[PDB]
Amino acid sequence: QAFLILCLLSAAFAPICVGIVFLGFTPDHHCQSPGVAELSQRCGWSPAEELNYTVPGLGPAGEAFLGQCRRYEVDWNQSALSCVDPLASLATNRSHLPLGPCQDGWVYDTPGSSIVTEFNLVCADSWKLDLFQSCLNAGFLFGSLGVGYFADRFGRKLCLLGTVLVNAVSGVLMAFSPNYMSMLLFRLLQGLVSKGNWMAGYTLITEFVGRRTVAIMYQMAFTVGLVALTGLAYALPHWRWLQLAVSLPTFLFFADLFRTPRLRKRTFILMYLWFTDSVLYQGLILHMGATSGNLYLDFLYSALVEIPGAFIALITIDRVGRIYPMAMSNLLAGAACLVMIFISPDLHWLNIIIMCVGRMGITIAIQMICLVNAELYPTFVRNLGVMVCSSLCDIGGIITPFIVFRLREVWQALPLILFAVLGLLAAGVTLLLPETK
Numbered sequence: 001q002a003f004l005i006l007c008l009l010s011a012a013f014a015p016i017c018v019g020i021v022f023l024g025f026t027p028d029h030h031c032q033s034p035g036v037a038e039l040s041q042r043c044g045w046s047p048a049e050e051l052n053y054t055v056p057g058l059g060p061a062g063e064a065f066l067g068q069c070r071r072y073e074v075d076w077n078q079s080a081l082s083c084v085d086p087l088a089s090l091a092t093n094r095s096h097l098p099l100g101p102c103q104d105g106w107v108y109d110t111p112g113s114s115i116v117t118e119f120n121l122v123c124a125d126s127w128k129l130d131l132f133q134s135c136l137n138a139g140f141l142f143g144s145l146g147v148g149y150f151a152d153r154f155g156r157k158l159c160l161l162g163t164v165l166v167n168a169v170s171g172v173l174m175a176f177s178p179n180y181m182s183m184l185l186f187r188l189l190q191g192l193v194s195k196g197n198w199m200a201g202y203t204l205i206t207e208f209v210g211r212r213t214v215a216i217m218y219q220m221a222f223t224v225g226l227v228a229l230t231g232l233a234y235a236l237p238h239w240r241w242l243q244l245a246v247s248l249p250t251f252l253f254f255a256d257l258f259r260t261p262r263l264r265k266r267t268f269i270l271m272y273l274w275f276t277d278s279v280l281y282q283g284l285i286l287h288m289g290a291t292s293g294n295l296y297l298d299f300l301y302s303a304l305v306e307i308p309g310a311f312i313a314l315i316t317i318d319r320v321g322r323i324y325p326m327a328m329s330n331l332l333a334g335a336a337c338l339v340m341i342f343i344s345p346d347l348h349w350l351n352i353i354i355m356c357v358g359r360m361g362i363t364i365a366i367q368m369i370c371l372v373n374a375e376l377y378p379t380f381v382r383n384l385g386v387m388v389c390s391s392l393c394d395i396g397g398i399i400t401p402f403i404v405f406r407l408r409e410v411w412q413a414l415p416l417i418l419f420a421v422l423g424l425l426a427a428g429v430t431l432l433l434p435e436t437k
C-alpha cells in the first residue's frame with residue numbers, strides 16, 4: 001500500500017490553487033438595502049425584481065462595478081408602495097441618482113456560501129483575495145527555504161513527520177478561522193508545509209521505488225485527487241465544510257550559478273520558461289474560476305483533459321525530443337489564448353475546446369520542463385538550481401493574482417493579451433536552448 005499514501009498526498013495537494021478557485025468563487029454580490037428589501041418582501045417577493053430594483057444595473061460598456069457596490073437608496077422603503085418602480089419616487093434616471101457607499105453587509109445569491117460570503121471580500125476588497133493567494137505563494141517560497149533548512153538541520157524523517165502534522169493541524173484549524181488575519185496566517189503556514197511536504201513526497205516516490213513512470217503515476221494521482229476534490233466540492237459548497245473535509249484525509253496517523261556565460265543564458269531561459277508556465281497555468285485556472293457560471297462541470301472537464309496531456313508527454317519524451325516539443329506547446333498555448341480573446345461571445349463549446357487545448361499545452365510544457373531541469377543541470381548544484389528556479393516560480397505565483405485582479409477590473413481583454421504575449425515570447429525564446437536530448 002505504498003502507492004496509496006503517495007496518491008493521498010497528491011490529493012492533499014489539490015487545494016493549492018483549486019482551493020482558492022472553488023472557495024474564492026465570488027457570486028453576484030449586491031449590497032443590502034434596508035428599506036428596499038422590506039418592501040420587496042412585502043409586495044414583490046421576486047428575486048428577478050429584487051435584483052433589478054435594488055442595485056442600478058445600467059452600466060455602460062459592461063461596467064458592473066457601479067452596481068456591485070452601490071445601493072442608490074433614497075430611503076423610500078414602502079412609503080411609495082409602487083412595487084413596479086420604487087426608484088422612480090426620487091428620479092427617473094437610475095444612474096444619475098446619488099449612490100452612497102455600501103459599507104453594510106452584502107447579499108450573496110447562492111445556495112452555498114463561499115469565502116466571500118463569510119468574509120465580505122465582495123467588491124472593495126478583491127485585492128484582499130489577491131493578497132490571500134499571493135501570501136500562499138510567498139508561503140511556498142519561504143517553505144521551500146524552511147524545508148531545506150530543516151532537512152539540513154534534523155533529518156529526512158523527523159522533519160517529514162513534523163511537517164505532515166503541521167499540514168494537517170494547519171488545515172483543520174484553517175477550517176475554523178474566526179477572522180481574516182488568522183485565515184491568512186494559517187494559509188501562509190499551509191503553503192510552507194505543503195510545499196515542503198510535496199517536495200519530500202515526490203523525492204521519496206522517485207527515489208524509494210528503485211522510474212519516470214512512477215512520477216507520471218504520481219502526477220496522474222494528483223489529477224485524480226483534483227477530480228475527487230471537484231466532486232466533493234460540488235456536493236457541499238460551504239468553504240468551511242470543504243476545507244475541513246479536505247484537511248481531514250491528510251490526518252490519518254555553491255550559489256554561483258551565473259558564472260559561465262554559456263550556462264548563465266541557459267539558466268535565464270529555463271527560469272523564464274518555467275516562470276511563465278506557472279503564470280499561465282495559474283492564470284488559466286483562475287480565469288476559469290472567475291468567468292464560468294458552471295464552474296463545477298467546466299473545471300471537471302479541465303481536470304479530466306489533463307491526463308491525455310500526461311499520456312502525450314510520456315509518449316513524446318523520447319519521440320519528439322527535449323527542446324522541440326516545448327516550443328510547439330508554448331505556441332499552441334499562445335494561439336489558444338488569442339482564440340480565447342477572439343471567441344469570447346462566439347460559442348461556449350468553442351470556448352471549452354480552446355480551454356482544454358490550452359490546458360493540455362500547459363501540462364505538456366510543465367512536464368517537459370520539469371524533466372529537462374533535472375536532466376541538464378550537473379549533479380553538484382542540481383538542487384541549488386531547482387531552488388533558484390522555484391524562487392522565480394513563487395515570484396510568478398505571487399504576481400499572477402496581483403495582475404489578474406488588477407487588470408480584469410478595468411478591462412477583460414488585458415489579462416488574455418498579457419497571457420498570449422507571455423506564451424508567444426516563451427515559444428519564441430525556448431528554441432535557442434542547446435540539445436538537451
Ligand SMILES: CN(C)C(=N)NC(=N)N
Pocket residue numbers: 219281366
Ligand atoms: C503538476 N505539478 C507537479 C505541480 N506542482 N503544478 C503546480 N501548479 N504546482
